């Protein structure tokens, strides 16, 4: 069974980025959607929409890439280099407002789920809240 | 100090023992455990039981010697 959804989604995204597939699919939830929204806001993805493949709610995830730098390994520049799902199940990581990570000392983000909705570390700082660190992104 | 209170006494090789150690039957009494000198090893000079060899013996423990002379 798909034991995590969010993590799976992230993995799929990563795979897509690796293979230079311009848009990936993934089943639809609210949490997932929220995460995607945040990503979009940041600039980690071109866009996203919510299709119905077969009959099941699904997400078009329009991936982002950097300009085709020529030479040895011409493969398109990576926008998302690494994205690790931090608060896995059976190891749920909750950081406080003191403890929210300085992810790549700024250049990237941690997707934090808080009582005041899904958001980024800067946003959390602004509101002055802690919560659950779903994932790391850079 | 570099101590030369060492005994340089003859001994007919009695016993073939491991690792080029050979109990050699001295004419300074019994057969002590006397081992090959490094020079011999270098020159591949073979000792079998029955060689009248000079054996270097320190007073501290005469138990162990040294086959100084090439037979």
């Amino acid at each position: 069974m798909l034991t995590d959804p969010i993590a799976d989604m992230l993995t799929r995204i990563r795979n897509a980025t690796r293979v230079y597939k311009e848009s990936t699919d993934v089943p639809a939830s609210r949490f997932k959607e929220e995460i995607l929204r945040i990503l979009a806001r940041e600039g980690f993805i071109k866009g996203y929409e919510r299709v119905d493949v077969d009959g099941k709610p699904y997400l078009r995830v329009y991936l982002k890439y950097g300009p085709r730098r020529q030479g040895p390994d011409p493969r398109p520049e990576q926008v998302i280099h690494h994205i690790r799902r931090i608060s896995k199940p059976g190891r749920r990581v909750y950081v406080g407002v003191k403890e929210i990570p300085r992810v790549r000392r700024g250049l990237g983000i941690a997707i934090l789920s808080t009582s005041k909705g899904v958001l980024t570390d800067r946003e959390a700082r602004k509101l002055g809240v802690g919560g659950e660190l779903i994932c790391e992104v850079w | 100090a570099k101590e030369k209170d060492t005994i340089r006494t003859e001994g007919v090789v009695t016993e073939a023992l491991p690792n080029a150690t050979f109990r050699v039957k001295l004419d300074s009494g019994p057969e002590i455990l006397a081992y090959i000198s490094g020079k011999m090893r270098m020159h591949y000079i073979r000792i079998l039981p029955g060689d009248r060899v000079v054996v270097e013996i320190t007073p501290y423990d005469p138990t162990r010697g040294r086959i100084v002379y090439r037979k």
Binding site: - | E3, D61, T63
Partner: protein, 124 residues
């Protein structure tokens, strides 16, 4: 492994065995010799290294490496041990510390004194 497993068992803390049973972790232990002999090293090296079977105030009989240039130790003599593995020799994990009790200092020693128990020689 996986966090639940860890929780169940934990990590088996690397409990460390010491290289010296001089006991009490005693920096030094004193004792008296049962024998005093010389020992062949092994197969890398061939020399004759002076060593002493010494009974201890804790009871553990140890062959113990005498260092220096040549000792004056007899048999029923009080010696003090600092330990510290000798590489070549078997059963010997112990240096005798010359300069205390019956192990009098390394005579003629003139360079590295402290390790050997040599009193200062008088200059001009």
């Amino acid at each position: 492994p996986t966090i639940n497993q860890l929780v169940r068992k934990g990590r088996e803390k690397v409990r460390k065995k010491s290289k010296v049973p001089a006991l009490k972790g005693a920096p030094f232990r004193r004792g008296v010799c049962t024998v005093v002999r010389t020992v062949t090293p092994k197969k890398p090296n061939s020399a004759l290294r002076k060593v002493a079977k010494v009974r201890l105030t804790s009871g553990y009989e140890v062959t113990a490496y005498i260092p220096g240039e040549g000792h004056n130790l007899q048999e029923h003599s009080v010696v003090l041990i600092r330990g510290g593995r000798v590489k070549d020799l078997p059963g010997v994990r112990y240096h005798i510390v010359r300069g205390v009790y019956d192990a009098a200092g390394v005579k003629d020693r003139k360079k590295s004194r402290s390790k050997y128990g040599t009193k200062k020689p008088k200059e001009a």
